[PDB]
Structure formats: structure tokens, C-alpha cells
């Protein structure tokens, strides 16, 4: 598995990345995500296409970590992103802690 910091600069065609989903857009027949690391301060755009996108439609959870396995690296507008492809696979990370915090409106203090 490569870090997003790696992904941003690698020359590989195929990669696998463990990362957090910080944005979901289910805009029809495709899922578009932003994913995030602890290696970098930048997000990475991921597009999940027909086939794969069929099972992940309503599945993704915000801030959850997943293994994106054997995705394809591409460049669009000077921006690197990853895409689904025939060999691709996605798995929820089994070692993740759900933390629930509440923030209080501060104008009260």
C-alpha cells in the first residue's frame, strides 16, 4: 500500500491506497470521492465506475478508512486522481476506531 504522498508523485499505473473518505458525490452511474491521508495535507479524487460503483452506491461512510486496491493512476487538470478498473477492489479497514464527538456552539461561553 502506498501513501497519498507517494501516489501524488509515483510513476506506477497501478496502486493500492489506504485512506479516509472525506467527500461523496453519487452523481449517477459513477461515484466520485475525495480521499485523505495522514501522510499529506491534500485530498485525492477517486472516480468509481460501473461494475464496482454498483456495490458501493450507498455504502461509503464519511471519515471511514478503506483499502482501495489496484486502482489506476491518471492525470486530468494537472491533478492526479485514481479510477476504478477491472482488477480493482475496495475493502473497509478492519482496524478502525469510531470516535463520536460533539461540538458546542461557542457563542454561549
In angstroms, what is the radius of gyration? 15 Å
CATH architecture: Beta Barrel
CATH topology-level fold name: OB fold (Dihydrolipoamide Acetyltransferase, E2P)
Query: How would you write the strand order of the largest sheet?
Result: 1-2-3-5-4
| Residue share in β-strands | 35-45%
Number of H/I helices = 2
Name of the CATH superfamily:
Nucleic acid-binding proteins
Structure classification: mainly beta
Q: So what's the overall shape?
A: globular
Q: Return the string of H and E elements.
A: HEEEHEEE
Helix content bin: under 10%
Distance, first to last CA: 45 Å
The profile of the biggest β sheet is: 5 strands, mixed, barrel
Number of domains: 1
CATH class reads Mainly Beta
Count of distinct strands: 6
Amino acid at each position: 500500500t502506498l501513501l497519498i504522498s507517494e501516489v501524488l508523485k509515483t510513476s506506477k499505473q497501478y496502486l493500492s491506497v489506504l485512506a479516509q473518505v472525506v467527500d461523496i458525490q453519487s452523481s449517477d452511474k459513477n461515484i466520485r470521492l475525495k480521499i485523505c491521508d495522514n501522510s499529506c495535507n491534500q485530498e485525492l479524487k477517486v472516480v468509481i465506475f460501473p461494475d464496482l460503483c454498483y456495490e458501493w452506491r450507498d455504502k461509503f461512510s464519511i471519515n471511514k478508512w478503506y483499502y482501495f486496491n489496484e486502482f489506476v493512476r491518471q492525470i486530468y487538470n494537472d491533478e492526479v486522481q485514481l479510477k476504478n478498473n477491472i482488477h480493482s477492489s475496495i475493502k473497509e479497514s478492519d482496524d478502525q476506531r469510531k470516535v463520536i464527538t460533539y461540538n458546542q456552539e461557542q457563542g454561549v461561553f
